[PDB]
Design a protein around this ligand. Structure first.
Ligand SMILES: N[C@H](C(=O)O)[C@H](OCc1ccccc1)C(=O)O
Ligand code: NA
Ligand code: NA
Length: 416
């Protein structure tokens, strides 16, 4: 009966109904002290949605690169790789600079109270750059898939796809027949993954309702106070990054911003609620093929962009750095501000593939400017932003995914 009517209704409109209702209901229950009820019963339905998305990440990445790399010539793949790497560094570098400007205007944490509390552990030492680069080659190809290591998986899939093309050009019929059979089986696996993604988004309206309700009930109350200025500075900066950066580049290269934003609305919104770039990859890759991007292009740029490209995260580090200093009353020299920009860019690619790189990257920036986290006083200031980290996390992820899609279109247009 009514089961069908739920289906024909547009999916995107159903998400907006859940998102608005989740924020409204979350605030009401939090005010009347019913946070435990939301945590016990409402949250598990939200956790089901994120587990479904993370299940498809590994099979869809390996299968897409093998098919994608086979279609594209080896020479063209090199030109695509160098272009996208240059794009990531420039956009991330400018995002940090934009965050510095916003912090100065708002001037957050001028007179916030400081109290001694729990001390953070000694910051994790970043692995040497030579170890990061050498870890791209997987010692065991099957071990990388089982352990969910994205970066080693990309390396093995690209070379496997290239080797298949040479086999299909051989003069031996037996070798040619075997190569086509292997490629067809892998191609079928990729197509099956996309079919599952469509079914998952039908459950998305329920999933988005639970996640927003839980966070607002427990954490939305703490926005009031000096932390409100921090939230205003970050979100205004994030809004500028989407408009002042991405839209300008799209106009320069001839891509229509209005046409692009219509296709990318699905990918942008789902990243806001899940707050996981890796979990959004199945949706993001589905959006890329809809625009008409070539299979070889988006199969390689999007998985790499999720790991290394952090535009919204970079702006978060720049704004948070000023807040800590303002709490202590320290003053940042113009030369020291330039040090932040260089440190943030290097840390983005210097922590590729390490678990929980968010903590390490922020610690490295604080150490560079002369404010080690080991200082007990900065730890109290640090543990103040983490009070509203989850709320800022929701908007931080949206910019990260947007930067990935914008770069893919620019390279695709240049491809011809
Ligand atoms: N949450 C974002 C994401 O999932 O990409 C982003 O990244 C956080 C993160 C999470 C796990 C590992 C590394 C970095 C952030 O700063 O919030
Ligand atoms: Na970037
Ligand atoms: Na990104």
């Amino acid at each position: 009966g009514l089961y069908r009517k739920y289906i024909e209704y547009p999916v995107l409109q159903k998400i907006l109904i859940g998102l608005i209702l989740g924020a409204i209901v979350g605030l009401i229950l939090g005010h009347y002290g019913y946070a435990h009820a939301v945590h016990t019963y409402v949250k598990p339905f939200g956790d089901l949605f994120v587990r479904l998305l993370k299940m498809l990440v590994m099979p869809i990445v390996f299968a897409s690169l093998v098919v994608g790399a086979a279609s594209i010539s080896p020479a063209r793949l090199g030109r695509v790789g160098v272009k996208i790497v240059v794009y990531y560094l420039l956009t991330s570098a400018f995002a940090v600079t934009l965050g510095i400007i916003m912090a100065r205007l708002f001037n957050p944490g001028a007179g916030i109270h400081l109290a001694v509390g729990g001390q953070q552990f000694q910051p994790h030492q970043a692995p040497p750059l030579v170890h990061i680069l050498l870890d791209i080659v997987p010692t065991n190809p099957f071990g990388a898939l089982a352990n969910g290591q994205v970066l080693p998986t990309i390396f093995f899939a690209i070379i496997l796809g290239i080797a298949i093309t040479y086999l299909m050009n051989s003069e031996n019929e037996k070798v040619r027949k075997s190569a086509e059979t292997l490629l067809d089986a892998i191609n079928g696996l990729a197509e099956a993954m996309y079919k599952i993604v469509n079914g998952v988004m039908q459950y998305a309206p329920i999933g988005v309702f639970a996640l927003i309700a839980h966070v607002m009930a427990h954490q939305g109350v703490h926005v009031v106070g000096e932390l409100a200025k921090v939230t205003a500075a970050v979100y205004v900066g994030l809004t500028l990054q989407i408009l002042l950066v991405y839209f300008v580049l799209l106009k320069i290269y001839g891509i229509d911003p209005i046409s692009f934003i219509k296709h990318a609305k699905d990918a942008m919104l789902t990243a806001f609620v899940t707050s996981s770039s890796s979990g959004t990859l199945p949706v993001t890759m589905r959006v890329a093929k809809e625009m008409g991007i070539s299979e070889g292009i988006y199969s390689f740029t999007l998985p790499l962009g999720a790991t290394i490209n952090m535009d919204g995260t970079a702006l978060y580090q720049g704004v948070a750095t000023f807040f800590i200093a303002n709490a202590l009353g320290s003053h940042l020299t113009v030369g020291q501000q330039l040090t932040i920009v260089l440190t943030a860019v290097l840390a983005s690619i210097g922590t590729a593939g390490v678990p929980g790189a968010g903590a390490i990257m922020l610690a490295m920036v604080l150490h560079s400017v002369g404010l080690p986290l080991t200082d007990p006083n900065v730890a109290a200031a640090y543990a103040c932003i983490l009070g509203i980290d989850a709320i800022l996390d929701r908007g931080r992820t949206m910019v990260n995914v947007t930067g990935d899609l914008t770069g893919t279109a620019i390279v695709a247009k240049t491809e011809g």
